[PDB]
């Protein structure tokens, strides 16, 4: 939702890390017409993590949106911005003709053309020298055989989908050393007590009767274990409340049988548990 957008030949490079990536704002800002992902499914972005996320923003035409993909050929996908074949990420683009256009012709957006060599993936060339196209070059002044490499976009109102300005944002995901620290939100739920609920406080998978505890911990301690290395107490990461992890219920049921030689009526015995935690006499 930024106001000033970078050109396609000088696309923006913002390192995003050490934060929670709430991707709902992406779906809330625009109808995401050109939303297409290549490494992760368009819905599992909140269920995994990455080390660093790079957001590349630029403005192109509506037909040039198809050039933002791993392996392409075109004016932008050869000389302006190229994605590697191993691109694992999403491509977001939407119409922006309402702000990036003017009646006299918007000239702040240009695209490079006629480069002598294809740019490597994720490359940015800031130089803007003349394009020498002859063994009798100019004396530095642009003209014959020294044509300008940057051509201005034809951004104007009343244009069609083929030429209207479209703002594109490329979210590249990276994995390397220094393990992942920027993940999506996990949507924590409300706390349930006095029930045999499964708990996952900061990854502590288990099951037990979460009851209020009086064993005050230290400010820097989050879990608690007994002699048997079994976790029996955990703090809710939302507050300073401490809960004891007691074993919910387990015990061998013994069936009292007087013997089929006499009768068929039998009884059961739930060893080590109350009668209030089991499904006449």
């Amino acid at each position, epitope marked *: 939702n930024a106001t000033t957008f970078a050109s396609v030949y000088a696309w923006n490079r913002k390192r995003i890390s050490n934060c929670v990536a709430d991707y709902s704002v992406i779906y809330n800002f625009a109808p995401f017409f050109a939303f297409k992902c290549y490494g992760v499914s368009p819905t599992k972005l909140n269920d995994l993590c990455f080390t660093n996320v790079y957001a590349d923003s630029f403005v192109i035409r509506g037909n040039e949106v198809s050039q933002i993909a791993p392996g392409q050929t075109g004016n932008i996908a050869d000389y302006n911005y190229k994605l590697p074949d191993d691109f694992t990420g999403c491509v977001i683009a939407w*119409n922006s003709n*309402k702000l990036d256009s003017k009646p006299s012709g918007n000239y702040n957006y240009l695209y490079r053309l006629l480069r002598k060599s294809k740019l490597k993936p994720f490359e940015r060339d800031i130089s803007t020298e003349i394009y020498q196209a002859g063994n009798k070059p100019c004396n530095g002044v642009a003209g014959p055989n020294c044509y300008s490499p940057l051509q201005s976009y034809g951004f*104007r109102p*009343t244009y*069609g*989908v083929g030429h209207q300005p479209y703002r594109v944002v490329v979210l590249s995901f990276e994995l390397l050393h220094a393990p992942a620290t920027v993940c999506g939100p996990k949507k924590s739920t409300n706390l349930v007590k006095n029930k045999c609920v499964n708990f996952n406080f900061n990854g502590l998978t288990g099951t037990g009767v979460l009851t209020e505890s009086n064993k005050k911990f230290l400010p820097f301690q989050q879990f608690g274990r007994d002699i048997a290395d079994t976790t029996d107490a955990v703090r809710d990461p939302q507050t300073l409340e401490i809960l004891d992890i007691t074993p919910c219920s387990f015990g061998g049921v013994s069936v009292i049988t007087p013997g089929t030689n006499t009768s068929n009526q039998v009884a059961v015995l739930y060893q080590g548990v109350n009668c209030t935690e089991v499904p006449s006499n």
Partner: antibody
Amino acid sequence: QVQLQESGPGLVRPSQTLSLTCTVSGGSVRNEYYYWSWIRQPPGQGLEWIGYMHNSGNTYYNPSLKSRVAISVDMSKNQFSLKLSSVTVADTAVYYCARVDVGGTLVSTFDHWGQGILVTVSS
Amino acid sequence: EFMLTQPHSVSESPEMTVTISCTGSSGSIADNYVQWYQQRPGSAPTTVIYENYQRPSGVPNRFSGSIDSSSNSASLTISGLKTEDEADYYCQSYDNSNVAVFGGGTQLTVLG
């Protein structure tokens, strides 16, 4: 072929607001290379243009009818609704929904048109 | 600032040639796709001109566009007027600031 379904009342009280709807039948409203516009036909006058709306919703409204006319597309039900306030004897005209081509060239060639709802206003 | 002007009605003898101009007295006209439409009483208007120099496929080939008088005043040249050509016409253009401007009512009739 593709047709344009219309719905909405044609009799309202003056100094009020009216919202008319129009649904594209036989196709899909989310198809590209086309806009979606509403068109007014004043009685005794010529043809009047209200505004067109892309699938992104750039809100190209009429300058003389600013803050008085508004249309919003809703691709979830393949329909778009026109709304306006202060309806009175000033216009009491008929409105038509239609689509227009933007396939490379400039916006032109209205190929599909609506039926039209006579918006009569009386106190 | 783009404005148009349309005459009330134009009529001539059958098989003659008439000229109806949109009169772009304000703003540039040649920089946009000039359009002409056709409407019958009751029904919605239909397209009779799709391009500045090309006609749509759904209309008989009897229309020709006069885009400019070398300064201004775009026009439409219709050759071979007959009884089926009697209908209403409307100029359609756009401003450079995305302001669409319809010319207005233009009724063509034949003096039978």
